[PDB]
Amino acid sequence: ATHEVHMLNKGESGAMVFEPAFVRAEPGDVINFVPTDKSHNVEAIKEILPEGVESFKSKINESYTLTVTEPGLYGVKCTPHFGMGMVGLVQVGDAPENLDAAKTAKMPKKARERMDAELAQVN
Amino acid sequence: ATHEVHMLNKGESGAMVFEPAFVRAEPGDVINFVPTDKSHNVEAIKEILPEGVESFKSKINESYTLTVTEPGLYGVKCTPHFGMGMVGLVQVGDAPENLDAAKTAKMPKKARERMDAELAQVN
Amino acid sequence: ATHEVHMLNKGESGAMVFEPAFVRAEPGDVINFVPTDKSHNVEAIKEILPEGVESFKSKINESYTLTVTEPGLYGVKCTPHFGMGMVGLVQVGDAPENLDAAKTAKMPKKARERMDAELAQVN
Amino acid sequence: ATHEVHMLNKGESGAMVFEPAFVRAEPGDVINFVPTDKSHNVEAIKEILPEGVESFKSKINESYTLTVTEPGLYGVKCTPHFGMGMVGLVQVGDAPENLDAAKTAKMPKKARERMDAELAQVN
Ligand SMILES: [Cu+2]
Numbered sequence: 001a002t003h004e005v006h007m008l009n010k011g012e013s014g015a016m017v018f019e020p021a022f023v024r025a026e027p028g029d030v031i032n033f034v035p036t037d038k039s040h041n042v043e044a045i046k047e048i049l050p051e052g053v054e055s056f057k058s059k060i061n062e063s064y065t066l067t068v069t070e071p072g073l074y075g076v077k078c079t080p081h082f083g084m085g086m087v088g089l090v091q092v093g094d095a096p097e098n099l100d101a102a103k104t105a106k107m108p109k110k111a112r113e114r115m116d117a118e119l120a121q122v123n
Numbered sequence: 124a125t126h127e128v129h130m131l132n133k134g135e136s137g138a139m140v141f142e143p144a145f146v147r148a149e150p151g152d153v154i155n156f157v158p159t160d161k162s163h164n165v166e167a168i169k170e171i172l173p174e175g176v177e178s179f180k181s182k183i184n185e186s187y188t189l190t191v192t193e194p195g196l197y198g199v200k201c202t203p204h205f206g207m208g209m210v211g212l213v214q215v216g217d218a219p220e221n222l223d224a225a226k227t228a229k230m231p232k233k234a235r236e237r238m239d240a241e242l243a244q245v246n
Numbered sequence: 247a248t249h250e251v252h253m254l255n256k257g258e259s260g261a262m263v264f265e266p267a268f269v270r271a272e273p274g275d276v277i278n279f280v281p282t283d284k285s286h287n288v289e290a291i292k293e294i295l296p297e298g299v300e301s302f303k304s305k306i307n308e309s310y311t312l313t314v315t316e317p318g319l320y321g322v323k324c325t326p327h328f329g330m331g332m333v334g335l336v337q338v339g340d341a342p343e344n345l346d347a348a349k350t351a352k353m354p355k356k357a358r359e360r361m362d363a364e365l366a367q368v369n
Numbered sequence: 370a371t372h373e374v375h376m377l378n379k380g381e382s383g384a385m386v387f388e389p390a391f392v393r394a395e396p397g398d399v400i401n402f403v404p405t406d407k408s409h410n411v412e413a414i415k416e417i418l419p420e421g422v423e424s425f426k427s428k429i430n431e432s433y434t435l436t437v438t439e440p441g442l443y444g445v446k447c448t449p450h451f452g453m454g455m456v457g458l459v460q461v462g463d464a465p466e467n468l469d470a471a472k473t474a475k476m477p478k479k480a481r482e483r484m485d486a487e488l489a490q491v492n
């Protein structure tokens with residue numbers, strides 16, 4: 001299954017957001033990160049990735065296709081807007097092993113707020 | 124401004140969801156609830172409404188337009204899927220007075236989980 | 247099956263548009279007409295409706311749910327923006343009987359341009 | 370500005386489509402082609418490109434970002450689905466010089482049908 005995430009200046013939840021900010025996916029699914037508005041990218045949050053998953057960082061304004069082969073949590077940020085709290089979370093499969101890492105990862109205050117909100121969606 | 128909320132069997136955050144589940148709006152805005160999938164409606168959570176706002180309850184399978192004139196939090200549920208956690212939250216203006224009412228409102232376990240996730244977005 | 251059509255100020259195809267401007271649907275499907283931007287509505291083009299289908303006209307800024315029970319072509323306009331060419335076309339089933347009516351219906355020049363474009367999608 | 374085009378097995382206009390199939394853009398804009406469904410790519414129709422623009426051909430299942438620097442018409446096809454009519458058209462600037470080239474370019478019957486529909490949108 002394929003899921004789409006937009007990078008927005010002003011979304012339903014607030015400013016400088018990934019929308020949806022949380023995706024529950026299954027191993028092997030595809031996540032498409034697509035700008036709606038210019039100025040944004042998608043970059044892995046190093047500390048919030050499953051074992052073995054390589055970091056990624058897209059170029060500003062390009063669509064990025066992520067295949068989530070590995071189960072766990074994948075945290076993403078928008079590089080220029082990380083401090084503005086522009087972060088997203090993809091849960092791949094049940095009972096992610098790296099939940100504690102996602103809860104304790106250091107990031108800017110507003111990013112940590114939005115990440116805690118996303119974590120509240122884990123199921 | 125208009126805002127759109129989809130009523131879904133299976134959304135990015137899980138089964139039986141409003142998507143987006145949280146909307147930040149301004150006084151006077153309209154929230155359109157869209158029957159993307161059949162079987163859903165929108166109904167006020169009477170314990171999560173600003174002062175002076177009337178309850179509402181749409182018919183299954185219809186569009187519903189909520190005009191949010193008064194500031195504060197508006198909780199919504201889908202009537203047949205309340206116990207499956209199909210609840211949403213609209214924040215109108217800054218510093219909603221009824222935050223605590225929304226934190227404590229009685230509801231089915233899964234609805235309370237989702238509602239806590241929505242609350243985590245208030246800003 | 248359900249299909250969604252947005253009412254936009256500026257879409258990929260131009261200004262004051264329904265997007266998608268053409269939907270191929272099957273009898274019994276649902277069309278959701280949803281504003282993305284304020285100022286728009288959906289109204290039937292009288293002369294482009296199947297036999298027996300009643301006209302409709304939504305209120306500005308509200309989502310409108312149309313069940314396309316009857317086969318044929320359903321032409322729609324946005325009332326205030328008809329002259330700006332804000333029109334859409336829904337083909338319900340094969341070989342619509344009212345094709346000639348859709349080709350010859352009088353409307354403002356820009357509406358006729360966009361309707362001819364939509365007609366070029368009939369299949 | 371960014372623009373998004375989805376690559377779909379089944380879209381609103383029929384099977385094997387770019388959606389939107391026609392994009393109006395400005396010099397410098399980017400067009401993101403998004404693999405919403407697998408099995409697709411984007412490839413230039415070399416007979417429908419402005420002067421001085423290089424051909425391109427993406428890999429199946431990947432995002433592709435086309436930067437449209439030069440004014441005129443850019444025709445695109447999905448390589449495995451060209452005969453199934455999976456073609457798109459991007460208009461960059463006013464009064465494209467290569468309109469006639471796009472009207473007459475040789476292609477499979479269904480691709481020519483879709484391409485004529487896209488052309489009907491040029492303005
Ligand atoms: Cu950003």
Ligand SMILES: [Cu+2]
Nearest residue numbers: 163201204209
């Ligand atoms: Cu429901």
Ligand SMILES: [Cu+2]
Nearest residue numbers: 286324327332
């Ligand atoms: Cu309009």
Ligand SMILES: [Cu+2]
Nearest residue numbers: 409447450455
């Ligand atoms: Cu294809």
